[PDB]
Ligand binder design. Structure first.
Ligand SMILES: NC(=O)c1cc(NC(=O)c2cc(-c3cccc(N)n3)ccc2Cl)n(-c2ccccc2)n1
Ligand SMILES: O=c1[nH]cnc2scc(-c3ccc(F)cc3)c12
Length: 290
């Protein structure tokens, strides 16, 4: 149910196994593990560089063919706000996908660790939002539907650089963010919960939810409610409240992403243009004054 596979239906670089030196396990899911590794002879002037390596547990013909198609699409995705894909290693089991290493981990973990529970300021929160929007503009321009846009599926590198990307293990690491196939219901618009239909318009809705995560420093949307209760609020048209750290100007943008009718939601290009203008000239808003 990945966006990569969704886009596949609707030359890959090969790295020698011996050029990869596994250093530590970063995470794991049902499909395999993710390692921190050193990769030799990959980038110029960097005889050694850190990479994140996704290892696939299953080595069957269908898993191999799916892997290849995903690797072809990942090679094609090239943007400043998309996690860099360096290539594969198909030298037997486990099949490996090599990505750049994002030193601050996923954006949800980053927000929670840089929040009140020092804390990121308004200008930094707007820069994070603008970068996530820029990656989504790129994906929409390719008619690529993410299907699971959320802060847990964004990564943070050196110098507050934020990019869209994940190692396909969020349904395991953040199982609490999904409901049973495992659907990310708190991030979904009513037509996706009801008809299980994902579009660029449903990605825009999830972007509004990402904005809410950003300005609550990574809190789960509808945190006071159970999964079935959250489905009810969304299908009935209840809206997430404006976070305290969120200026009215950003809340108006979220509300634009959350129009009930998919055809009435702002385009991501317009959402990005608005957030970019606010990141360069932040509104004078003190969260303490509300
Ligand atoms: N839930 C799943 O099974 C699932 C969900 C995903 N992520 C995507 O499809 C996905 C991945 C990227 C991306 C791009 C660049 C680097 C980078 N690291 N990621 C962007 C958008 C999407 Cl939408 N994978 C998955 C399957 C294979 C590899 C990684 C993840 N598996
Ligand atoms: O990831 C870890 N977490 C806790 N203890 C250990 S001991 C060794 C590891 C390790 C080292 C290299 C790897 F490729 C994978 C795992 C490790």
């Amino acid at each position: 149910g990945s966006g990569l596979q969704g886009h596949i239906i609707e030359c890959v670089h090969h790295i020698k196994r011996r050029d990869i030196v596994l250093k530590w396990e970063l995470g794991e899911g049902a499909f395999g593990k993710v390692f921190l590794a050193e990769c030799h002879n990959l980038l110029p002037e960097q005889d050694k560089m850190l990479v994140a390596v996704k290892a696939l547990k299953e080595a069957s013909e269908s898993a191999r063919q799916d892997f290849q198609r995903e690797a072809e699409l990942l090679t094609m995705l090239q943007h400043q706000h998309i996690v860099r894909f360096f290539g594969v290693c198909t030298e037997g089991r486990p099949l490996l996908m090599v990505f750049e290493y994002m030193r601050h981990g996923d954006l949800n973990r980053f927000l929670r660790s840089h929040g009140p529970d020092g804390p990121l300021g308004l200008g930094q929160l707007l820069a994070v939002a603008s970068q996530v929007a820029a990656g989504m503009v790129y994906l929409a321009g390719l008619h690529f539907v993410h299907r699971d846009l959320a802060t847990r599926n964004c990564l943070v590198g050196q110098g507050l650089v934020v990019k869209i990307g994940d190692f396909g293990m969020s349904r395991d690491i953040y199982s609490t963010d999904y409901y049973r196939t495992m659907l990310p219901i708190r991030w979904m618009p009513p037509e996706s919960i009801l008809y299980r239909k994902f579009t660029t318009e449903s990605d825009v809705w999830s972007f509004g939810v990402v904005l809410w995560e950003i300005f609550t420093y990574g809190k789960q949307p509808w945190y006071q409610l159970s999964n079935t209760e959250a489905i009810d609020c969304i299908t009935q048209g209840r809206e997430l409240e404006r976070p305290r750290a969120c200026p009215p100007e950003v809340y108006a943008i979220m509300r634009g992403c959350w129009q009930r009718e998919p055809q009435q939601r702002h385009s991501i290009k317009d959402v990005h243009a608005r957030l970019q203008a606010l990141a360069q000239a932040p509104p004078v808003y003190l969260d303490v004054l509300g």
